[PDB]
Design a binder for these strands. Structure first.
Ligand code: ADP
Ligand code: ALF
Ligand code: K
Ligand code: K
Ligand code: K
Ligand code: K
Ligand code: K
Ligand code: K
Ligand code: K
Ligand code: MG
Length: 438
DNA sequence: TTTTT
């Protein structure tokens, strides 16, 4: 599909030489595309020893991986390293993975906290009896620190400040050619100006001119980016509430042996929704990796709701809980090829909080769907969007404007609402980082 | 005001 540039090939060459490194570049410079090639090559060599990870769930799906937290076995990794190590040792699946890992890839490194990275460093050494940096694991960090910083409640501790980073990262390589907006050089200039936070008048004016409504085909739906979840949930709601069709309500079956409030506080953070509201034609996103083609993050469109089964050791212990309501959603999913579709009948799935031995502590049964329509700027980081409307109203964080506006392929498929330079800012420590790279 | 099980 894609020929790697000579810059992309040079990075790949360094990674295959075993050097622990961080490679960076502006939004859309082909970092993740290269990363997928790195993965393929590194896995010919170490078939079971390449750990693919990203800071967020959606950015991990973009490279066929899992979150950094999920790879570790940390849960949230909040306590002290002495306790985190015991927890990981109880998870014999994660403990084995820590010892069999040869390369650790972390995409979207900007959102990885340096304190988390220092714990991962100490845990790597301990579990592997290896005093090398990261216990001998080759660290491959990939991302852009002008993009979103680690999420906080200076408290913000960037990854490049950690002692782990300084003793492990041996080389930094910068990709310079921007592919996502390559057709529009002015657009690239405007996006680049946002990086350091200083926005010239012409760039600011050129973004305000994008407030014009987008005109799209009948079936082309533009993605909506917002800073907060309230907006995302409201934007999904208003879109659903305009569709007629007597909205179908799917309540989740929530069980568990944990006491309260612990059980409620665990369920609150499940991606699967407690109440899934669906109409006909509602935009949706799959949140489970079913197939090699239909994976977590795949966008789709619901066409109908009926199945009385006619439309043609623990598993059983969990099938009893499946009352099967009466009706499954019929959803047509745009496959990861851009054009073709695949319609499938979406069955309910189970998400479990468990203990290392296998005893499920909390269970939620729900269809693996969320009304997609809208999306947080945080979760957009890493995505490419052909047609997108960005509402900068509640932007509160450094690099959030830059990430949001840089998701677009072109200005013709981008609408910007409530643009303001006050919303465009970068962290002092990020700017000094990139200026020291000389 | 966001993300991470
Ligand atoms: N070498 C290349 N040639 C052509 N297009 C590319 C190349 N590398 C990346 N792209 C395109 O650029 C877009 C963004 O690339 P991505 O890997 O998401 O960059 P980053 O991760 O740095 O944002 C993708 O749609 C991809 O198809
Ligand atoms: F740097 Al990106 F999508 F990962 F623009
Ligand atoms: K050893
Ligand atoms: K041009
Ligand atoms: K100016
Ligand atoms: K213009
Ligand atoms: K059900
Ligand atoms: K907003
Ligand atoms: K700001
Ligand atoms: Mg990327």
């Amino acid at each position: 599909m894609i020929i790697l540039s000579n810059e992309q090939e040079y990075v790949l060459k360094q990674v295959l030489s075993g050097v622990s490194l961080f490679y960076t570049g502006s939004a859309g410079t082909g970092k993740s595309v290269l990363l997928r090639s790195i993965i393929k090559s590194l896995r010919d060599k170490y078939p079971k020893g390449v750990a693919v990870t990203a800071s967020t769930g959606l950015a991990a799906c973009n490279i066929g991986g899992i979150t950094l937290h999920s790879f570790a076995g940390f849960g949230l990794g909040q306590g002290k390293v002495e306790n985190l190590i015991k927890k990981i040792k109880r998870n014999k699946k994660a403990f084995t993975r820590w010892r069999e890992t040869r390369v650790l890839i972390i995409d979207e490194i900007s959102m990885v906290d340096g304190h988390l990275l220092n714990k991962l460093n100490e845990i790597a050494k301990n579990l592997r009896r290896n005093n090398r940096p990261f216990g001998g694991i080759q660290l491959v960090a990939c991302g852009d620190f002008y993009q979103l910083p680690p999420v906080v409640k200076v408290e913000v501790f960037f990854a490049f400040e950690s002692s782990a980073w300084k003793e492990t990262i041996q080389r930094t390589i910068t990709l310079k050619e921007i592919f996502r907006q390559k057709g529009d050089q002015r657009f690239i200039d405007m996006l680049n100006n946002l990086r350091d936070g200083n926005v010239p008048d012409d760039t600011a004016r050129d973004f305000c001119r994008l407030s014009r409504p987008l005109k799209c085909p009948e079936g082309i739906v533009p993605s909506e980016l917002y800073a907060t979840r309230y907006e995302v949930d409201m934007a999904n709601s208003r879109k659903l509430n305009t569709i007629q069709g007597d909205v179908v309500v799917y309540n989740s079956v929530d069980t568990g042996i944990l006491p309260e409030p612990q059980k409620t506080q665990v369920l609150t953070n499940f991606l699967a929704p407690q109440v899934l509201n669906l109409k006909v034609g509602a935009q949706v996103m799959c949140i489970k990796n079913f197939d090699d083609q239909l994976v977590n993050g795949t966008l789709g469109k619901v066409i109908d709701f009926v199945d009385r089964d006619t439309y043609m050791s623990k598993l059983k212990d969990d099938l009893m809980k499946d009352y099967k309501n009466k009706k499954y959603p019929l959803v047509k999913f745009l496959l990861p090829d851009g054009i073709t579709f695949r319609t499938v009948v979406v069955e309910p799935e189970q998400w479990t909080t468990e203990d290392e031995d296998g005893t499920v502590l909390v269970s939620r049964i729900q269809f693996p769907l969320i009304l997609a329509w809208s999306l947080s700027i945080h979760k957009s980081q890493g995505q490419t969007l052909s047609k997108v409307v960005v509402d900068m109203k509640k932007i509160f964080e450094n690099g959030q404007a830059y990430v949001a506006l840089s998701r677009a392929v072109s200005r013709a498929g981008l609408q910007v609402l409530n643009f303001n330079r006050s919303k465009v800012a970068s962290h002092r420590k990020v700017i000094e980082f990139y200026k020291n790279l000389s």
